[PDB]
Amino acid sequence: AMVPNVVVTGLTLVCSSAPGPLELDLTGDLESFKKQSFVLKEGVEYRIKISFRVNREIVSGMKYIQHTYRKGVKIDKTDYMVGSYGPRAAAYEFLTPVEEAPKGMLARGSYSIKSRFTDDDKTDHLSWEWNLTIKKDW
């Protein structure tokens, strides 16, 4: 009861080219993302931004983990060391390095991503699943 020490609040694809917002509110119903997708134009640059709050005490070794699937088949895994954080009023933001969306006809289509935010105590701060659809155009 009932403000947890760590609350993962959002995922955003930061993409200058995109004509609309690309945000998941992670304080919401996580199951809903499975039938939703972010659309990205092929080859566009973007970062993933994870927003999270620390409310009471230091947390060490925060880590963001992504696994990428295509048609239910695992194709990639990436781990990002986020670091050690103490409490503060404002949400922290972790940004992945710039990446490009896949490009070329064979690579277009939908991909699913399983995301986890954890720490060196292996706490399941949040796990969620979301989809990315790569298209010729926005």
Q: End-to-end distance of the chain based on CA atoms, in angstroms?
A: 44
The secondary structure of residue 97, as a DSSP letter, is: P
Parse the chain into domains and list their residue ranges.
Answer: 1-138
Q: Where does 1-138 sit in CATH, by number? A: 2.70.50.30
Q: In the structure encoding, which two tokens stand for residue 114, read together?
A: 């399983």
Report the alpha-carbon distance of residue 46 to residue 97 in Å, rounded: 8
SS3 72: coil
Q: Regarding beta strands 38-41 and 92-95, do their DSSP bridges make them parallel or antiparallel, or are they unpaired?
A: unpaired
DSSP conformation letters of 114-129: EEEEE-TT----EEEE
How many alpha carbons lie under 13 Å from residue 33 in its C-beta half-sphere? Answer: 25
Report the alpha-carbon distance of residue 34 to residue 113 in Å, rounded: 10
Technique used to solve these coordinates:
X-ray
